[PDB]
Amino acid sequence: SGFRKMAFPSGKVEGCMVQVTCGTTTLNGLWLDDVVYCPRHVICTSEDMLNPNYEDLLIRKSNHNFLVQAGNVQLRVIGHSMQNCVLKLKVDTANPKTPKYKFVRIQPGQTFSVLACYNGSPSGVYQCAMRPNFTIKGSFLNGSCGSVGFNIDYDCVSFCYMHHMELPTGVHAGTDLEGNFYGPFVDRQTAQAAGTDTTITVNVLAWLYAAVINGDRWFLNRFTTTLNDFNLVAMKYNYEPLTQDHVDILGPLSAQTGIAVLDMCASLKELLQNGMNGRTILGSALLEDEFTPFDVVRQCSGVTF
Amino acid sequence: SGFRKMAFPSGKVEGCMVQVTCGTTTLNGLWLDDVVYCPRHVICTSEDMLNPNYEDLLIRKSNHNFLVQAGNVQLRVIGHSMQNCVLKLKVDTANPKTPKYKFVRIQPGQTFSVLACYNGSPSGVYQCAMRPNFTIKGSFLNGSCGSVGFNIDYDCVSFCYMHHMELPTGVHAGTDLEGNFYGPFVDRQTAQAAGTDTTITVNVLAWLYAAVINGDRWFLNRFTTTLNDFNLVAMKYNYEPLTQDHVDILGPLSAQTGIAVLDMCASLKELLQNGMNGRTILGSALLEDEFTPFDVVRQCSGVTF
Numbered sequence A, B: 001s002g003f004r005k006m007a008f009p010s011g012k013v014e015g016c017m018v019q020v021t022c023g024t025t026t027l028n029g030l031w032l033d034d035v036v037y038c039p040r041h042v043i044c045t046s047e048d049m050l051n052p053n054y055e056d057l058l059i060r061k062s063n064h065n066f067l068v069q070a071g072n073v074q075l076r077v078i079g080h081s082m083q084n085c086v087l088k089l090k091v092d093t094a095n096p097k098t099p100k101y102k103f104v105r106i107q108p109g110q111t112f113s114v115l116a117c118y119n120g121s122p123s124g125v126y127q128c129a130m131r132p133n134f135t136i137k138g139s140f141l142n143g144s145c146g147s148v149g150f151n152i153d154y155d156c157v158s159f160c161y162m163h164h165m166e167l168p169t170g171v172h173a174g175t176d177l178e179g180n181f182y183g184p185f186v187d188r189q190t191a192q193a194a195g196t197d198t199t200i201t202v203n204v205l206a207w208l209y210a211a212v213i214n215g216d217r218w219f220l221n222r223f224t225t226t227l228n229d230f231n232l233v234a235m236k237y238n239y240e241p242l243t244q245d246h247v248d249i250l251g252p253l254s255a256q257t258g259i260a261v262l263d264m265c266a267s268l269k270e271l272l273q274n275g276m277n278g279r280t281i282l283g284s285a286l287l288e289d290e291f292t293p294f295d296v297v298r299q300c301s302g303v304t305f
């Protein structure tokens, strides 16, 4: 037993990380087949980043201006293009460590692992949730851009995120691997505000199931409720509405534990109205919303890749 | 910026994991050079685990009774021995993915990453601290034994932990890679109690430095203190005594932030005497003691491997 925030094993993605240097700027790139994907602001100087005209900066770059290194080996760039906010650098060598992969764009409330990298080398791995306001609570320093987030399904790596920037509130923003930002953010050094965030209700319920499975059962009460009455109570606490799709997604957990979804909703309604009263759940004094139903099932049934 | 519990990149260790099956029991093994290391209770049946005589069970096993698989490839066992609580299986193939490695035995208060595995395949990665009572707060199901914990230093993997069992309180226990348990635990299915735990003071101070670096600065006060007076206050709250070695270990953090170690100790003394009063630090309503000073520096300076 035990329940921990846990990231996917990262080796499949470690074998794809390279360093991308243009002039004086260096960041990370993702090397898949014979293409390196990286944030387009690698072509910026310090002065350009306040309001860059990326199309203009890219015209004055040729293939040889991009120094791509995989460990101690230079990869010769033989082509380049821009796709929204990412650059694609064609190289003369296909990555022999290319895993089976997909590019996906995730929905708010879904989680992924981030492999944080500097200079093309891995530094660490941690789990993140795409917030309803399209930000993530990461840990990124200078040079971390091009670090990617991903999920794994058996042998297939689904890349969903590439890191571009930090917001004044401390949170982080990036793009899918087609270079389209999550959220209303742009890749320039200017103050940008995230929308007001919301608590991912279905993830809180998943976490409460995780808690019951791991012995923490004091918050369960004898009542049921209806979706309508639960959503009425939870709206005032800035919880996103719980849909019937969300209930259906929680179905297998409710079947495994034998606690109906609307009974757990009754328990969460009581927790929202009365607080925890000093008690903890899975060690936390706060309700946690960064575990999806699938993360709970994954960890509590031992799914491997 | 941002501060997250983050694990080491796991690919170096993923390339060493194999499945070890003896009769009807299967668990994980660590394949380094031509030796597979795994928990010795792989040679137990269900009935044996209540009080096993491991030396007796091993005499009736020969090399061929151990089925070692790396992916879809059987590794032929050509030798076997027992070293305390681990088995060493010599195989006719050296692992081509063997990283540079050491076996180390860590001290209470140190952290490591655990790569949780089932059937020789990786499931997830998470960070753990060796508690002062020699347990860890992991997430392990049946079949997880042989999963290892480790640190990475540049290119060298220091293996420090191999998982053997769960305790009635929900916590976990295991051995170093020489098979000596951490703590007063034995590898049999019997009720065993962990010693009463203690809060790792030097790790709390490291985490408070991490908080200051990341904007969370409200708990800083204008006072200093002495090691003696701090330890007097902190003893009653079940905090382990802060030694001068601990202060010296925190030295670089105090230099980077410009906050003296004994000033941060004054801040923590106030936090222990008065609580947090509803406020949080790095998102947590509790004082966190599972980040070492080195984890803080690592994450806040971008150390890669």
Ligand SMILES: *C(=N)[C@H](C[C@@H]1CCNC1=O)NC(=O)[C@@H](CC(C)C)NC(=O)c1ccc(-c2ccc(F)cc2)cc1
Pocket (backbone or CB within 6 Å): A027, A041, A049, A140, A141, A142, A143, A144, A145, A146, A163, A164, A165, A166, A167, A168, A172, A186, A187, A188, A189, A190, A191, A192, B001
């Ligand atoms: C990638 N290597 C890097 C990652 C960030 C640096 C430190 N932490 C990060 O997450 N990206 C950038 O440095 C860069 C990219 C832009 C999009 C070209 N800029 C920013 O991340 C950034 C930082 C701060 C501000 C800002 C502006 C005004 C304020 F009042 C407050 C903050 C804007 C952009």
Ligand SMILES: *C(=N)[C@H](C[C@@H]1CCNC1=O)NC(=O)[C@@H](CC(C)C)NC(=O)c1ccc(-c2ccc(F)cc2)cc1
Pocket (backbone or CB within 6 Å): A001, B027, B041, B049, B140, B141, B142, B143, B144, B145, B146, B163, B164, B165, B166, B167, B168, B172, B186, B187, B188, B189, B190, B191, B192
């Ligand atoms: C390894 N594959 C496995 C990992 C544990 C199984 C579930 N979670 C784990 O961490 N090890 C074992 O299953 C096994 C190993 C022994 C040392 C041979 N036993 C235990 O982990 C275990 C579990 C529970 C008790 C126990 C006894 C009495 C009680 F009142 C309460 C609990 C003892 C040993």
